Amino acid sequence: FPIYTIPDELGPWSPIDIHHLSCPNNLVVEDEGCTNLSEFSYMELKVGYISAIKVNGFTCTGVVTRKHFRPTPDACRAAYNWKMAGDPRYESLIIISPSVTDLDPYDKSLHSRVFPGGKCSGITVSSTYCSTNHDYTIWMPENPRPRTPCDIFTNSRGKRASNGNKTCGFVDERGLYKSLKGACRLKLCGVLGLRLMDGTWVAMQTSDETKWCPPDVKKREECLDALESIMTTKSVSFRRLSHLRKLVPGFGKAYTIFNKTLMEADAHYKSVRTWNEIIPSKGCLKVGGRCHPHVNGVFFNGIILGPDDHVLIPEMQSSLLQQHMELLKSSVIPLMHPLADPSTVFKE
Amino acid sequence: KFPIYTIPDELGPWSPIDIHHLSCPNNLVVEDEGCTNLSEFSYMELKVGYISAIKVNGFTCTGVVTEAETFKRKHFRPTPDACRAAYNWKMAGDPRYRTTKESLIIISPSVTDLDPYDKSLHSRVFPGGKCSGITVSSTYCSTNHDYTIWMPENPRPRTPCDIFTNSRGKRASNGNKTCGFVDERGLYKSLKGACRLKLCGVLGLRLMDGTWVAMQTSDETKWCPPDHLVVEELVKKREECLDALESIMTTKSVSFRRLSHLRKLVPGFGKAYTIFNKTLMEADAHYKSVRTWNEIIPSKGCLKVGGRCHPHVNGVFFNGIILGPDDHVLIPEMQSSLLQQHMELLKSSVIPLMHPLADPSTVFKEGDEAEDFVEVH
């Protein structure tokens, strides 16, 4: 159990609603089957495409001068293009960007709490729009006539680790073993592979007939308490934000806040032995061998620039002050000999 | 109404005590409404380390005999000469403890106070601080244990009267009758409630805070014994020191945290406590206030007292202050303050933005009037 987890590689920052928040995974398969190795090159998803294939988009809401009306796609698109820069366009049509959706790999479906039940199933070139919870707004893609992206993989080198002919799993480019037990089969951009139970995908063939992925000392009690608190108050705090950080190595989300807009990014978390290997310099938070940059004093996961341009990590300080005060709560015994007035005893 | 902390202007030597020497501070303030015009002058006060009392170090001699036949040891009343000679070996030499062997087991340290009138020794090893003292004739004292005697760490001659120091100050008088002064530390001490005392043939007043001074302009006023304005904060802060002392004596144990409560919260004379290796110890202190933690911790491991970085002894300073593993001075009051800040900024929430149409619970209007989110465009 490490003292902290730091992402080895930060993915892109995509904005989210508080409803997208979820508690960490915390899996420790730990082999126990394989004591053999070999250098092989596996294929995985790039950070940014691991959790979901994000389709950027936007919402077009129709206004008449006020009253409402359901607009048409063509005019709405015309609005977007004349709104990414200063342009004459200013019955009026309002857009909001971005309205990100999560593309389903089964059927080109799009899941978003802006759709009724994450309803939009697909968008061939016969609809060009997509219904919304609002009867007078439509959702459309950031790019017109887009298609599924397929430059989403990366070649990486790891170790196979099989027991018999059967593959127990492997060791990723980060050095962490991952187990194939409990994984399902998934085909992405035609390539056949497996979705592991941590959420990662890898291109492999198993001689074990597996299922197919369906379309849908614990601290999790503390996590869900902190989280349900957020949904009950619609407000987030940098301590409750600290329970969302995965506590053990492996794939997870990293959260942050820009312009009071909650955001998440894919991350491979690695163990930390000393705080020093994370913060060598003063204002340096070392992510992947570099002083990670910030915006106006915030890094991800509640890590923020303190009141002195000092990298202030929450768990670091909490553990520190805990240790200091704990040093101050140590008891001792003074050594009086005949002070009380009790009697005639020998006393060693 | 209290300064954030209080640090000695200069410490006295350290004296070994037990938990029963522990007393709560006397956070006493003094106004003396008048006394506006101060006359620059010089006064004589007690040297730091003698203000409360004049300690005299000593040791306890217990005599026991062992009968090996299977041991059946018992006591005997020892002799002063052999106890002294064995004590002198306890420092450098080698002491050792049907056949029988007699043995003098020595206990150090045992400290007693001295009344300068009788030249008498007061302590709780005696019957009510009994010993008239030591002479050339009498070389020992009688303890509550019939087979145990007390003898000083020093030979019999101990003429003690080099206890004074001449300091500068300002005698604020008002017009007619001197009513107060300010010491070298720059703190107002008032004569309201002082009582006389003669020490080494020098008459002088002992004030309420405990300081003795060489001033006779009290006019005629009552002696000290042989031994209206109190804000709620003083009392409601005194009670927790009483709860902490009660906790200490009930538990027979001490900790740096519980030790920090006995600190004097306002400037003036007071006691400073600490513990080194299971040995509880105390020292005289002229406390002065602190405004910001920077002025008593300027460097990474510097505890500024008396114009210099104070030296620890195995990482323990005083008043619960110890040295952190990062070689950082850490003060109980300062660390608790820092915990309040650290959490009160962790305990700080914000309401992040919500895509108006991404909230499934947003009920849209009946009819066709506009919503509010589009007003912001």
TrEMBL record, chain A:
<comment type="similarity">
    <text>Belongs to the lyssavirus glycoprotein family.</text>
</comment>
<feature type="domain" description="Glycoprotein G PH">
    <location>
        <begin position="127"/>
        <end position="201"/>
    </location>
</feature>
<protein>
    <recommendedName>
        <fullName>Glycoprotein</fullName>
    </recommendedName>
</protein>
<feature type="domain" description="Spike glycoprotein G central">
    <location>
        <begin position="212"/>
        <end position="308"/>
    </location>
</feature>
TrEMBL record, chain B:
<keyword id="KW-0732">Signal</keyword>
<dbReference type="GO" id="GO:0055036">
    <property type="term" value="C:virion membrane"/>
</dbReference>
<keyword id="KW-0564">Palmitate</keyword>
<keyword id="KW-0472">Membrane</keyword>
<protein>
    <recommendedName>
        <fullName>Glycoprotein</fullName>
    </recommendedName>
</protein>
<dbReference type="GO" id="GO:0019031">
    <property type="term" value="C:viral envelope"/>
</dbReference>
<keyword id="KW-0325">Glycoprotein</keyword>
<keyword id="KW-0946">Virion</keyword>
<keyword id="KW-0261">Viral envelope protein</keyword>
<keyword id="KW-1133">Transmembrane helix</keyword>
<feature type="domain" description="Spike glycoprotein G central">
    <location>
        <begin position="223"/>
        <end position="326"/>
    </location>
</feature>
<feature type="domain" description="Glycoprotein G PH">
    <location>
        <begin position="138"/>
        <end position="212"/>
    </location>
</feature>
<keyword id="KW-0449">Lipoprotein</keyword>
<keyword id="KW-0812">Transmembrane</keyword>
<comment type="similarity">
    <text>Belongs to the lyssavirus glycoprotein family.</text>
</comment>
